[PDB]
Amino acid sequence: GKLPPGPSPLPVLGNLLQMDKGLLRSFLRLREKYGDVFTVYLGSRPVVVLCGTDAIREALVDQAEAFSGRGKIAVVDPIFQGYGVIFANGERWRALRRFSLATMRDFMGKRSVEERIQEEARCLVEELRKSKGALLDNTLLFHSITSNIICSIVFGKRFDYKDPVFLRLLDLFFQSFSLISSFSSQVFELFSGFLKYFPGTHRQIYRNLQEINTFIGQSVEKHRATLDPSNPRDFIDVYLLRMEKDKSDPSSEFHHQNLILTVLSLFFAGTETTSTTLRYGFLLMLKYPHVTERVQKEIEQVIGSHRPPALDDRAKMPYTDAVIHEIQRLGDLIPFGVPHTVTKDTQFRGYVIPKNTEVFPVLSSALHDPRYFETPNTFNPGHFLDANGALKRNEGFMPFSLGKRICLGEGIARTELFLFFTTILQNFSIASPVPPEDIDLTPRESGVGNVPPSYQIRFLARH
Numbered sequence: 001g002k003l004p005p006g007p008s009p010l011p012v013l014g015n016l017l018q019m020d021k022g023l024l025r026s027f028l029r030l031r032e033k034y035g036d037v038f039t040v041y042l043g044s045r046p047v048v049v050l051c052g053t054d055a056i057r058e059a060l061v062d063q064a065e066a067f068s069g070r071g072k073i074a075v076v077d078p079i080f081q082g083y084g085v086i087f088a089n090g091e092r093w094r095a096l097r098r099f100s101l102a103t104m105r106d107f108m109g110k111r112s113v114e115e116r117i118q119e120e121a122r123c124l125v126e127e128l129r130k131s132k133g134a135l136l137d138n139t140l141l142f143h144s145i146t147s148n149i150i151c152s153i154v155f156g157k158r159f160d161y162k163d164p165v166f167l168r169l170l171d172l173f174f175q176s177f178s179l180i181s182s183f184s185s186q187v188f189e190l191f192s193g194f195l196k197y198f199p200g201t202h203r204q205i206y207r208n209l210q211e212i213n214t215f216i217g218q219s220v221e222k223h224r225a226t227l228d229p230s231n232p233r234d235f236i237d238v239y240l241l242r243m244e245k246d247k248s249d250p251s252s253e254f255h256h257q258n259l260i261l262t263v264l265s266l267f268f269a270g271t272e273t274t275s276t277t278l279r280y281g282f283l284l285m286l287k288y289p290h291v292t293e294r295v296q297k298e299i300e301q302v303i304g305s306h307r308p309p310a311l312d313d314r315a316k317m318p319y320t321d322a323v324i325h326e327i328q329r330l331g332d333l334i335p336f337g338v339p340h341t342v343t344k345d346t347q348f349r350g351y352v353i354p355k356n357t358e359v360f361p362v363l364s365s366a367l368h369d370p371r372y373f374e375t376p377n378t379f380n381p382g383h384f385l386d387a388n389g390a391l392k393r394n395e396g397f398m399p400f401s402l403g404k405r406i407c408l409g410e411g412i413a414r415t416e417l418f419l420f421f422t423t424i425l426q427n428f429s430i431a432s433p434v435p436p437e438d439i440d441l442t443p444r445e446s447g448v449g450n451v452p453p454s455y456q457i458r459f460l461a462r463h
């Protein structure tokens with residue numbers, strides 16, 4: 001009728017009995033029948049699925065405001081309750097977002113995000129030197145360094161990598177991601193009005209997250225008791241000042257609740273995905289030693305062996321830059337996008353999408369678009385190099401998404417990827433027990449997060 005066309009749904013279950021192995025391949029078969037915009041019933045509610053670069057741009061870019069709503073994730077909603085950037089809607093979201101930009105684009109205290117990442121990179125190198133070339137799983141370290149960048153921005157400090165209190169909270173935090181992406185939580189996302197009365201992963205997510213909130217909560221009180229309003233140290237200080245100022249407005253959103261959850265929001269948006277992109281990139285660098293060998297020769301040409309890599313070096317390193325883009329593209333770590341909603345009844349391609357309908361923008365269908373990518377299932381830095389060896393970007397490259405919800409941390413993310421990759425490869429070459437030809441790139445869990453398989457790697461200190 002009005003909604004976009006899609007397969008006919010059963011009553012309670014919607015189109016689930018007809019869905020899968022992987023949702024991505026179902027969406028992909030459904031696109032083959034119904035085209036680039038279609039309706040699927042994942043449970044009783046309808047979801048509009050945007051496939052292809054085009055549909056996604058028309059929605060999120062041309063009718064941006066309409067498509068700037070955030071879809072609820074019920075597994076973590078009883079913790080978040082729509083606080084924090086990545087979870088907020090309407091005026092709360094606008095204000096939280098403008099404030100974060102007005103804030104994190106101002107690094108109150110004196111040291112920049114870039115300098116902090118360079119410092120984390122130095123600490124990483126020294127720590128990896130201690131391994132002496134022994135086989136390791138880099139999961140823990142890569143979680144630790146990206147957490148550390150958020151800790152630095154929000155709490156004004158980093159943690160040592162063997163800090164066992166930090167590691168205990170870190171284990172809890174990232175276990176909450178393994179759990180949110182489990183079947184038991186998928187089923188929960190569909191039947192939460194019922195299963196919330198039973199035992200399950202949701203009770204474990206809740207407890208793990210509330211335990212982290214407790215420590216965030218204690219850090220806020222410590223910041224307040226130690227505050228110098230003339231020299232804010234970090235995000236929390238700046239936010240505490242803004243609470244006072246707006247103290248006389250009860251339409252103001254700048255309260256204690258919003259602060260704990262926004263902080264936990266930033267860890268949640270800012271760590272796992274970046275960490276996993278790093279872990280994926282090093283899997284590709286083992287798989288293709290010639291690429292890693294060329295990135296090293298670019299590092300030596302432009303940077304040298306001595307001084308630390310800096311962000312201005314990127315513009316002079318189009319090859320390494322193209323390798324990073326291509327790790328993000330092939331890596332495809334958020335394949336279905338993060339769910340949106342429409343904020344009003346919305347006309348779109350002759351269809352009507354009623355307010356608050358959920359919408360999935362399937363970024364994967366853009367990252368693999370054969371219009372923009374000659375060989376989409378194969379690792380190829382060439383995708384982002386022109387005939388003169390300079391970097392090119394095209395409209396298929398939308399790993400951070402688009403429009404009003406575009407990744408708030410994009411520039412930080414790319415700085416992390418750039419400085420972590422080059423400062424590591426400047427100092428270490430790499431070797432694994434599995435030869436390149438036997439290395440498998442196929443995601444071990446292809447859900448909302450597309451996880452690379454576990455592997456072991458050596459970091460061999462250079463010259």
Ligand code: HEM
Nearest residue numbers: 085086269270273274277338400401405406407408409413
């Ligand atoms: C490789 C790393 C990252 C990738 C690929 C990534 C990608 C994304 C994507 C796809 C979204 C969804 C946008 C949408 O709703 O359409 C997102 C949202 C977001 N990202 Fe990132 N992100 C990354 C790292 C970060 C970092 C380092 C931060 C900084 C803390 C960050 C902060 C956020 C925030 C706050 C949102 C929610 C924005 C909103 O709803 O307004 N992300 N990110």
Ligand SMILES: OC[C@H]1O[C@H](O[C@H]2[C@H](O)[C@@H](O)[C@H](OCCCCCC3CCCCC3)O[C@@H]2CO)[C@H](O)[C@@H](O)[C@@H]1O
Nearest residue numbers: 147151155157165166169170173212215216218219267
């Ligand atoms: O007696 C004082 C104790 O406190 C010290 O450190 C604090 C630090 O000062 C304090 O900054 C820290 O709080 C961190 C709170 C939030 C943790 C956030 C994230 C960490 C990892 C990824 C997501 C969660 O917790 C530690 C303990 O609560 C140390 O933890 C202990 O060595 C010591 O015993």
Ligand SMILES: CCOC(=O)C1=C(COCCN)NC(C)=C(C(=O)OC)[C@H]1c1ccccc1Cl
Nearest residue numbers: 023042045073074180186189190336358447448
């Ligand atoms: C078969 C289940 O897929 C869904 O319908 C989802 C949905 C379904 O909710 C539909 C709400 N109208 N929501 C979420 C949150 C998803 C997710 O795993 O985040 C935890 C996705 C999702 C869940 C499991 C596996 C893949 C995806 Cl994309």
Ligand SMILES: CCOC(=O)C1=C(COCCN)NC(C)=C(C(=O)OC)[C@H]1c1ccccc1Cl
Nearest residue numbers: 073086177181268269270272273337338448449
């Ligand atoms: C909507 C809040 O969820 C997030 O913020 C998440 C994010 C937020 O950070 C993403 C990058 N900005 N990252 C990851 C990894 C998620 C995940 O489930 O991994 C298991 C997701 C997530 C991504 C897509 C769909 C559902 C979820 Cl729970």
